[PDB]
Amino acid sequence: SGFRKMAFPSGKVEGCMVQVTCGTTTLNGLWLDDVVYCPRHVICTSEDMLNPNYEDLLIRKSNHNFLVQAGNVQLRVIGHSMQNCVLKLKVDTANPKTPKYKFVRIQPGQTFSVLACYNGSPSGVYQCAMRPNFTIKGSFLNGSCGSVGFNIDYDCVSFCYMHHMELPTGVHAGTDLEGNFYGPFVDRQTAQAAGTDTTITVNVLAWLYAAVINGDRWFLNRFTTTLNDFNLVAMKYNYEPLTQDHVDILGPLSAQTGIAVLDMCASLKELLQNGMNGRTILGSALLEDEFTPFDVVRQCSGVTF
Amino acid sequence: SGFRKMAFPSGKVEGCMVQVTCGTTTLNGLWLDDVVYCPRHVICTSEDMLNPNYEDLLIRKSNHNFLVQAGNVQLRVIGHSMQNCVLKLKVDTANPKTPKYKFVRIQPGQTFSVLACYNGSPSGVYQCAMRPNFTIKGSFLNGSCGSVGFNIDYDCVSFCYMHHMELPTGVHAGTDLEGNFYGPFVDRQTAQAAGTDTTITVNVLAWLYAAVINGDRWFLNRFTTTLNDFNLVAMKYNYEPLTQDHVDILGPLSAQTGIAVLDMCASLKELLQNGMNGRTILGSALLEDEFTPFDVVRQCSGVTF
Numbered sequence: 174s175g176f177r178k179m180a181f182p183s184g185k186v187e188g189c190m191v192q193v194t195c196g197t198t199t200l201n202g203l204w205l206d207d208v209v210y211c212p213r214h215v216i217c218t219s220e221d222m223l224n225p226n227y228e229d230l231l232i233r234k235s236n237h238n239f240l241v242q243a244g245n246v247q248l249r250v251i252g253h254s255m256q257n258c259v260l261k262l263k264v265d266t267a268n269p270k271t272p273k274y275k276f277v278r279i280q281p282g283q284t285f286s287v288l289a290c291y292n293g294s295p296s297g298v299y300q301c302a303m304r305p306n307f308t309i310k311g312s313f314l315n316g317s318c319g320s321v322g323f324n325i326d327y328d329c330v331s332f333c334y335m336h337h338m339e340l341p342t343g344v345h346a347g348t349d350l351e352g353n354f355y356g357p358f359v360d361r362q363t364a365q366a367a368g369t370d371t372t373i374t375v376n377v378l379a380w381l382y383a384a385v386i387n388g389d390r391w392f393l394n395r396f397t398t399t400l401n402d403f404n405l406v407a408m409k410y411n412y413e414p415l416t417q418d419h420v421d422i423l424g425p426l427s428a429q430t431g432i433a434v435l436d437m438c439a440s441l442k443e444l445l446q447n448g449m450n451g452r453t454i455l456g457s458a459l460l461e462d463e464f465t466p467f468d469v470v471r472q473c474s475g476v477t478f
Numbered sequence: 479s480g481f482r483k484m485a486f487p488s489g490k491v492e493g494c495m496v497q498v499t500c501g502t503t504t505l506n507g508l509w510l511d512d513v514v515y516c517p518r519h520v521i522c523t524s525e526d527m528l529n530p531n532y533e534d535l536l537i538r539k540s541n542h543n544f545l546v547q548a549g550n551v552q553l554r555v556i557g558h559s560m561q562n563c564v565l566k567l568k569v570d571t572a573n574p575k576t577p578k579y580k581f582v583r584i585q586p587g588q589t590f591s592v593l594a595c596y597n598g599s600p601s602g603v604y605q606c607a608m609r610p611n612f613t614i615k616g617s618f619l620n621g622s623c624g625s626v627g628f629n630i631d632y633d634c635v636s637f638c639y640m641h642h643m644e645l646p647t648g649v650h651a652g653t654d655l656e657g658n659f660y661g662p663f664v665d666r667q668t669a670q671a672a673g674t675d676t677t678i679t680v681n682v683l684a685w686l687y688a689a690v691i692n693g694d695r696w697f698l699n700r701f702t703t704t705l706n707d708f709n710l711v712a713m714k715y716n717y718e719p720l721t722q723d724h725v726d727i728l729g730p731l732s733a734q735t736g737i738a739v740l741d742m743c744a745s746l747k748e749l750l751q752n753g754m755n756g757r758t759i760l761g762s763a764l765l766e767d768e769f770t771p772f773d774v775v776r777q778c779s780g781v782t783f
């Protein structure tokens with residue numbers, strides 16, 4: 174028992190992290206097979222970042238301008254290309270530590286693990302969610318760009334995020350591994366505000382199921398509700414609307430606990446309308462929304478990799 | 479910016495996890511050099527667990543009764559011995575993935591990362607603290623025994639915890655890597671209640687410094703206090719008493735932020751007396767106490783490994 178914000182074991186990704194230096198800029202890259210992926214803004218100076226023309230800046234760069242270092246050993250760069258907002262550096266050596274992997278573009282509300290890195294060296298690992306406004310609430314300092322987010326299905330690493338920027342509000346923006354930003358953000362130091370950070374309703378419900386499984390039940394009540402009735406409440410509290418797809422995804426937690434999804438919605442409704450009255454749920458004094466239904470089943474069952 | 483409950487990268491420990499089977503019991507072991515460490519209750523049947531005589535039970539076991547499997551390959555056991563509550567299984571092969579390591583016995587209030595494992599396979603990583611009552615609030619299912627807790631200082635893994643048991647209240651008990659339990663617990667299925675789970679005052683103060691560094695400042699007030707005055711408040715709220723040693727350890731966060739330690743104590747005092755009035759600090763609606771002063775400096779600076 175016990176329920177924790179749990180990251181995937183990071184070893185398979187640690188073996189892929191390298192340092193990329195272009196001119197005087199250094200950040201992290203991801204070495205898979207014979208390609209190193211990194212943010213294209215590695216080619217920018219401090220000056221360039223206000224409105225860079227990446228295609229023009231890249232004309233001035235050759236393979237030998239990209240210094241790639243894997244631990245203590247230098248990699249030989251034999252080609253380079255820009256794909257959307259990432260650079261792909263072809264090296265002459267396949268990473269012998271390459272895990273089975275895929276590139277995935279996740280949906281808002283999905284969770285993943287981040288391996289924060291500096292100078293190609295891993296610093297820590299933590300769990301995040303793609304927020305509905307397509308930011309993530311990470312922990313990133315200068316030098317952390319190129320750190321990646323990922324999920325692991327047994328032996329396969331699904332890479333879903335590469336870190337590019339911190340917005341003025343302290344939240345984080347980045348791309349998938351094809352270099353397309355999540356949300357409307359651009360790799361330019363300009364005014365870009367984040368939209369409404371709505372709460373991921375299906376995740377809160379999953380976490381309430383986790384609470385019940387782990388002994389925290391005081392929030393269970395005598396009520397039920399309907400999808401439409403619940404969603405009038407969700408709207409008022411800036412919660413995502415709940416759909417039948419969400420209900421279906423919660424089925425297995427319903428089955429394990431014997432608590433119908435709409436009954437649990439009625440408990441969440443009461444929690445939204447009345448607050449938690451100084452009580453806690455799984456060690457938290459607010460409603461946690463960065464556990465997916467899959468996350469709860471995985472942690473409460475013990476799937477390994 | 480941003481502040482997250484962050485675990486150490488787990489790769490160095492993943493390479494040490496093995497499966498140990500004695501008879502029909504299977505749990506996890508830690509393979510360092512040519513020794514495998516695991517909980518001695520691997521030799522117990524379900525029956526034996528009420529009051530086992532481990533020395534008598536071990537008489538019936540030989541080297542070949544301990545099946546040790548590292549991934550897909552079997553290890554040859556060439557000796558075995560009991561040290562306190564752990565077994566040490568000597569194998570004929572040194573683990574080629576052994577990191578530089580030490581064994582450390584941590585103090586209550588210190589934090590560490592746990593690599594939850596099942597059948598020798600890592601499942602996830604998360605950050606915990608040794609509570610003042612010498613339990614930890616983990617996430618452990620049946621089969622997770624032998625999973626370990628650790629810190630990493632650059633290249634050196636300091637192992638501090640091996641998981642042995644879940645208490646009836648859902649919290650967790652275990653040993654250092656010399657096999658001595660933290661707290662008064664025993665590897666016996668009997669009545670053992672946990673003591674008062676007091677809050678780790680110096681950690682809360684560190685986390686408040688982290689909040690200030692990361693933009694959350696609404697809890698700063700116009701007041702100061704004294705150690706003795708603050709501790710009258712700490713006592714009332716089941717907080718650990720604050721000592722000058724604690725004050726000294728917070729010096730660097732004081733210096734970075736320009737907020738004197740006793741001023742921050744006065745802010746915490748007001749938070750304890752008045753609550754947070756529906757506000758949040760670093761994404762939390764309660765006062766977090768599982769970040770040490772060192773944890774805050776590390777995350778807010780970017781130390782790597």
Ligand SMILES: CC(=O)O[C@H]1C[C@@]2(C)[C@@H](C[C@@H](O)[C@H]3[C@@]4(C)CC[C@@H](O)[C@@H](C)[C@@H]4CC[C@@]32C)/C1=C(\CCC=C(C)C)C(=O)O
Nearest residue numbers: 199200214219220222315316317318337338339360361362
């Ligand atoms: C190594 C390092 O510290 O670089 C950091 C620090 C960085 C050079 C930043 C890019 C850009 O803001 C930079 C300028 C010159 C932008 C213009 C002004 O505002 C300056 C006051 C500011 C100082 C440095 C800073 C803040 C970096 C980034 C790039 C982030 C990506 C984008 C698209 C902004 C990085 O993390 O690589």
Ligand SMILES: CC(=O)O[C@H]1C[C@@]2(C)[C@@H](C[C@@H](O)[C@H]3[C@@]4(C)CC[C@@H](O)[C@@H](C)[C@@H]4CC[C@@]32C)/C1=C(\CCC=C(C)C)C(=O)O
Nearest residue numbers: 504505519524525527620621622623642643644665666667
């Ligand atoms: C693989 C597995 O499921 O074993 C788990 C499950 C386990 C065999 C447990 C040890 C002990 O409680 C067991 C008994 C027989 C204890 C006596 C009764 O209460 C039973 C209702 C109970 C059922 C199984 C259980 C709960 C295990 C432990 C050992 C934990 C260590 C101690 C000292 C208790 C383990 O995790 O290895």
